[PDB]
Design a protein around this motif. Structure first.
Motif, short mmCIF file in Angstrom:
data_model
loop_
_atom_site.label_atom_id
_atom_site.label_comp_id
_atom_site.label_asym_id
_atom_site.label_seq_id
_atom_site.Cartn_x
_atom_site.Cartn_y
_atom_site.Cartn_z
N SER A 1 0.80 -1.25 0.00
CA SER A 1 0.00 0.00 0.00
C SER A 1 0.83 1.30 0.00
CB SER A 1 -0.99 0.01 1.17
OG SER A 1 -0.34 0.29 2.40
N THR A 2 0.18 2.43 -0.25
CA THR A 2 0.91 3.68 -0.48
C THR A 2 1.59 4.16 0.78
OG1 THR A 2 -1.07 5.08 -0.08
CG2 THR A 2 -0.72 4.43 -2.29
N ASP A 3 2.75 4.78 0.62
CA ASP A 3 3.50 5.35 1.74
C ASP A 3 3.92 6.79 1.56
OD1 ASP A 3 5.98 5.42 0.14
OD2 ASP A 3 6.11 3.31 0.36
N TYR A 4 3.43 7.45 0.51
CA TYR A 4 3.92 8.76 0.11
C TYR A 4 2.77 9.67 -0.29
CZ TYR A 4 6.62 12.37 -2.30
OH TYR A 4 7.20 13.54 -2.70
N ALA B 1 12.97 7.60 -7.82
CA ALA B 1 12.30 8.52 -6.90
C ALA B 1 10.82 8.20 -6.84
CB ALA B 1 12.54 9.99 -7.30
N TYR B 2 10.00 9.14 -6.40
CA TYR B 2 8.61 8.81 -6.12
C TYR B 2 7.77 8.43 -7.33
CZ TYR B 2 7.52 13.69 -7.28
OH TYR B 2 7.36 14.89 -7.96
N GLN B 3 6.64 7.78 -7.05
CA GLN B 3 5.74 7.24 -8.06
C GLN B 3 4.32 7.35 -7.53
OE1 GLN B 3 5.94 2.86 -8.79
NE2 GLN B 3 6.31 3.43 -10.92
N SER C 1 8.85 1.71 -8.81
CA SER C 1 9.37 0.46 -9.36
C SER C 1 8.85 0.27 -10.79
CB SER C 1 8.94 -0.73 -8.49
OG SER C 1 9.17 -1.98 -9.15
N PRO C 2 9.69 -0.25 -11.68
CA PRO C 2 9.24 -0.54 -13.05
C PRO C 2 8.36 -1.78 -13.07
CG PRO C 2 11.48 -1.35 -12.78
CD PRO C 2 11.10 -0.65 -11.48
N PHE C 3 8.20 -2.47 -11.94
CA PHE C 3 7.42 -3.71 -11.81
C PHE C 3 6.08 -3.53 -11.08
CE2 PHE C 3 12.07 -5.03 -11.38
CZ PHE C 3 12.23 -5.29 -12.77
N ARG C 4 5.81 -2.30 -10.63
CA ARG C 4 4.60 -2.03 -9.84
C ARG C 4 3.36 -1.98 -10.72
NH1 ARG C 4 6.37 1.33 -6.20
NH2 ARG C 4 6.28 -0.23 -4.55
N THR C 5 2.30 -2.61 -10.24
CA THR C 5 0.97 -2.41 -10.78
C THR C 5 0.29 -1.44 -9.83
OG1 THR C 5 0.78 -4.55 -11.89
CG2 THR C 5 -1.26 -3.51 -11.33
N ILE C 6 0.01 -0.26 -10.35
CA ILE C 6 -0.71 0.76 -9.62
C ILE C 6 -2.21 0.54 -9.79
CG2 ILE C 6 -1.20 3.23 -9.47
CD1 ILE C 6 2.16 1.94 -10.80
N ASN C 7 -2.91 0.44 -8.67
CA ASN C 7 -4.36 0.33 -8.65
C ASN C 7 -4.93 1.69 -8.23
OD1 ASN C 7 -4.49 -2.83 -8.81
ND2 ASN C 7 -3.08 -2.39 -7.12
N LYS D 1 -1.20 10.21 -4.20
CA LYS D 1 -0.66 9.25 -3.25
C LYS D 1 0.07 8.17 -4.03
CE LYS D 1 -3.41 9.59 1.02
NZ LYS D 1 -4.45 8.97 1.94
N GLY D 2 1.10 7.62 -3.44
CA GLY D 2 1.85 6.57 -4.09
C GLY D 2 2.99 6.13 -3.21
N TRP D 3 4.16 5.98 -3.81
CA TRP D 3 5.27 5.32 -3.16
C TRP D 3 6.51 6.19 -3.22
CZ3 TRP D 3 1.50 3.39 -6.18
CH2 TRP D 3 0.67 2.42 -5.60
N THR D 4 7.23 6.24 -2.11
CA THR D 4 8.51 6.95 -2.02
C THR D 4 9.53 6.45 -3.06
OG1 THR D 4 8.10 7.30 0.36
CG2 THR D 4 10.34 7.69 -0.40
N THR D 5 9.59 5.13 -3.24
CA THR D 5 10.44 4.52 -4.26
C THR D 5 9.60 3.85 -5.33
OG1 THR D 5 12.09 4.09 -2.58
CG2 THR D 5 12.35 2.88 -4.60
#
Length: 185
Positions: free
Chosen positions: A2-5, A165-167, A46-52, A40-44
């Motif tokens: 889950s999101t951290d950013y 960086a963030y995503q 990833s090229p492998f993340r599926t964003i929902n 909202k999203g992630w601090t780091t």
């Protein structure tokens, strides 16, 4: 995972009322703005993340984007996967197309000079874009299988940097007014 950013950046004027909601939820209400990105999203990234996400409200009045937004360094790249917009469909230098998550996207590149970035106010970097050919419907659960965009970008010589960086799943506005409500996971 889950999101951290939380992203809430504004510049140039007007009002941007952004609320950091429960879980992956946030809302934006804005008027007569300069430029802003909220999400909202992630601090780091990833090229492998599926964003929902689920945009319960997508109501730009003028120019806003409902878009994956993120950066790499090494080198400095700004990237977008634009699913919806208002009155302005963003583009750049056409490279090709990619199909992902039930949508066909045009792929664009743009080089930015003297421009604001995560590094500072006056920088040079490249932008990578996937922009949906037509606006994605909202209010239902959506995925962005970001690997599909990374792989397509790579095939047109558009390689991302190696320091992530963030995503975020963002509401961006430029010189506009509007409302959004989005949940990200």
């Amino acid at each position: 995972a889950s999101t951290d950013y939380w992203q809430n950046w504004t510049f140039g004027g007007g009002i941007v009322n952004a609320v950091n909601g429960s879980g992956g939820n946030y809302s934006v209400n804005w008027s007569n703005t300069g430029n802003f990105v909220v999400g909202k999203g992630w601090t780091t990234g990833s090229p492998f993340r599926t964003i929902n996400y689920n945009a319960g409200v997508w109501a730009p009045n003028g120019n806003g984007y409902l878009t994956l937004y993120g950066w790499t360094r090494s080198p400095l790249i700004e990237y977008y996967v634009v699913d919806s917009w208002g009155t302005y469909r963003p583009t750049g230098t056409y490279k090709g197309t990619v199909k992902s998550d039930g949508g066909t996207y045009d792929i664009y590149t743009t080089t930015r000079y003297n421009a604001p970035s995560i590094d500072g106010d006056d920088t040079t970097f490249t932008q990578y874009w996937s922009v949906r050919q037509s606006k994605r419907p909202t209010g239902s659960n959506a995925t962005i299988t970001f690997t599909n965009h990374v792989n397509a970008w790579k095939s047109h010589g558009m390689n991302l940097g190696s320091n992530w960086a963030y995503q975020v799943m963002a509401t961006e506005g430029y010189q506009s007014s509007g409302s959004s409500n989005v949940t990200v996971w």
